[model samples]
Structures are given as C-alpha cells and as structure tokens.
Target chain A: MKQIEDKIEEIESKQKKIENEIARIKKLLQLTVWGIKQLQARILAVERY
Target chain B: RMKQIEDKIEEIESKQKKIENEIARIKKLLQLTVWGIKQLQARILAVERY
Candidate 1:
C-alpha cells in the first residue's frame, strides 16, 4: 500500500513539472505571435512605400 | 482503504494523460508558430529587396 502511495506522489510531482513546462512553452508561443505581428507590420510598410 | 487508494491512483493517472495531451497540443502550436515566423522573415527579406 505504501508503495502504491509513493507511486501516486511521484506521478503527482511529474504532473506539476509538466504543468510548469506548459506554462513556459505558452510564454514562448506568445512571444512568437508578437514577433510575427511585427514582421507583418514591417512587410506592410515596405509594400506601401 | 486499499480500494480507495487504487481508485485515487486511477484518477490521477487519467488526469495525467489529459495533461500530457495538452502539452502535445501546445507543442504543435509552437512548432507552427515558428514556421510562420520563418515565412514572415523570408517575406520581409524579399520585400526589402524590391
């Protein structure tokens, strides 16, 4: 029983780690979106000229 | 008590699977985003040349 409990704890810990990774990736995704927008604006400006 | 623990384990395991799926989804989004960035960069370079 104790062994099973320990397994649960380990899995829970892994879950937390995975959640943190997801958060980090989300931030990168946001930055990428911002970058793409900036590039799009630049392209528009160049086209206008 | 043992049955209760087993049930809890199953629940947690199921939740973990869902979380893993979410991670996979987000990772794919990120990959697509990177590809988009590259395409935009190429466009910008081409436009600047003109």
Candidate 2:
C-alpha cells in the first residue's frame, strides 16, 4: 500500500541519497588513497623532471 | 608506504563493498515484505467483497 510509505517519490529519493552516499564516499576517500600513496613518487618526479 | 596504503585501501574497499551489498540485500528484503503485506491486505479486502 502507498500508506506503507508516504509516497513512491520519497522512497525513490531516499534510495538516491543512499546511493549518492556510497558513491561519494568511495570516490572521495578510496580514490584519494591512490594520490596519497603516490605522493612521494610524484614529488620525486617533479623534482627530477 | 605505497604498499601499505594500497593494502589499506584494498581492505577499506572490501569493507565498503560488504556494507553496500548488505544494505542492498536488506533493502530488497524490505521491499518484498512491503509488497507481501500490501497483497495480503488486497486479498482480504477482496474476500470481504468490498
């Protein structure tokens, strides 16, 4: 029943929020790790070339 | 340090994947429960001839 939730709109919006949180966390935090891991190599390259 | 961070990232991503899968599965179960309840209510209403 629609009464089970306020509306399909709200449920879809909430699902979007959860998906965004997952995507944002993975992109910002996990991907940033690669940069951090390569920081030293990146610095050495800048200095040499 | 590169290897260390790489390992940590691997572990973290694994954990994130696990949590995402858990959430997705639980959400599916929630949807199924809602649908089942809604159908049962409709069936009961039909039996009432309303």
Candidate 3:
C-alpha cells in the first residue's frame, strides 16, 4: 500500500511538472503575439485617423 | 486511489481558469497599449514631417 501511494504521488508530480512547462511556455510566447498585434492595431488606427 | 486523480484534475482545472484569466488580462492590456500608441503617434506626426 505504501509503495502504491508513493507511485501515485510521483505520477501526480510528473503531471504537475508537465503542466507547469506548458503554462510557462504559453505565458512567455503569448506575449509576443500580443505585442505584434498591438503594433499592427496601433499603426492602423493612427494612420486611419 | 481513483479519487486522488479526480482531485488532481479538479485542481488542474482550477489552475487553468487562472491561466485563462491571465490571458484575458494580457489581451486587455494589448488593446489598451494600442490605443495609447495611437494617440502618441498622432501627436508625433503632428510635430514632425515623418
């Protein structure tokens, strides 16, 4: 029973580590897209006005 | 037990919602930044030929 519980905890930790990586990358690169979008919108709006 | 996995899934879902909220906030910031840049450009263009 102890070993089984230990294995289960390890599995959960791995799951969390994977998710943390996904969250980290998404958080980093999503900003790049947002930054470019902002530039495009700014130029269009200003030039149009 | 199976319940442990279920609980972890629930936790993951909750954390995902927080991530979604952050994404929404960054999007809002992007929109606001564009608006800010638009005003700045208008003023700059008025001051310079370029």
Candidate 4:
C-alpha cells in the first residue's frame, strides 16, 4: 500500500485528551450552570413569560 | 510534551472556575431582582412538563 486515504492510530493520546477535557468540563459545568440559571431566571421573567 | 500541554490546560481550568465564581457572585449581588418569576434554561429537556 503506497498511498491511502484513511488511517487509524492508537488511542492513548486521544483518549487522554478527551478524558481530561471531560473531567474539567464536568467540574466547570456545575459552577457555570448555577449562575446561568439564576441570570436566566431574571432575564426571562418579564421577556418570555 | 503532553504534560506541558496538560499544565497549560489546567491553567485555563482555574481561570474558568474563577469566571464561574464571579458570575455566581453577580447573581448573589442581585438579590433585589430575584423576586420576580423567571424561567431558567432547563438543559434537561426530558424533565420538562407541558
């Protein structure tokens, strides 16, 4: 096979990266959503409801 | 190499928490306006009822 359009690599690096991102986001998501919900409540109170 | 990149990402991680904390603080500061009824964005659409 001299040329090819596809390739598959090992999962170590990609898996590590995805795991770290997920871990970080999992923590950040909790804090971020708390305030977002409060603000959403204030903003949507009169406008949408 | 990966360790260095991971450390940099950790730096951003702390920054994200700081920003999140600030936003939470802002909401705490606005207690006066909290009395009104508000529909918060429910990310979980499954729990929503009609």
Q: Which run of 10 residues does model 2 chain A get worst, by summed lDDT?
A: A1-10
Indicate the fraction of true inter-chain contacts that candidate 1 also forms.
Answer: 0.85
- Which segments of candidate 2 are over 4 A away from where they belong? A1-49, B1-3, B47-50
The estimated TM-scores of all candidates read 0.78, 0.40, 0.49, 0.31
Quote model 1's TM-score: 0.78
- Residues A1-49, candidate 4, lDDT per residue (tens digit)? 2111111122244445555755665565565667667666655654565
Runs with alpha carbons beyond 4 Å of true place in candidate 4: A1-49, B33-50
Ranking by DockQ: 1, 3, 4, 2
Q: Write the per-residue lDDT of candidate 4 for residues B1-50, one digit (tens) a residue.
A: 85665565566556566755765565564443333322233432223333
Candidate 4: residue A40 lDDT (0-100): 63
RMSD of each: 2.1, 28.5, 8.9, 13.6
lDDT per residue as tens, model 2, B1-50: 85665565556556666766876776576556556655655654464452
TM-score per model for chain B alone?
0.76, 0.62, 0.82, 0.51
Top candidate (lDDT): 1
Clashing residue pairs found in predicted model 1:
none
Classified by CAPRI criteria, candidate 3 counts as incorrect
Interface root mean square deviation per prediction: 1.4, 27.7, 7.4, 12.8
Model 3, which residues run further than 4 Å from truth? Answer: A1-49
Give the CAPRI rating of model 4: incorrect
> What is the DockQ score of candidate 2, to 2 decimals?
0.01
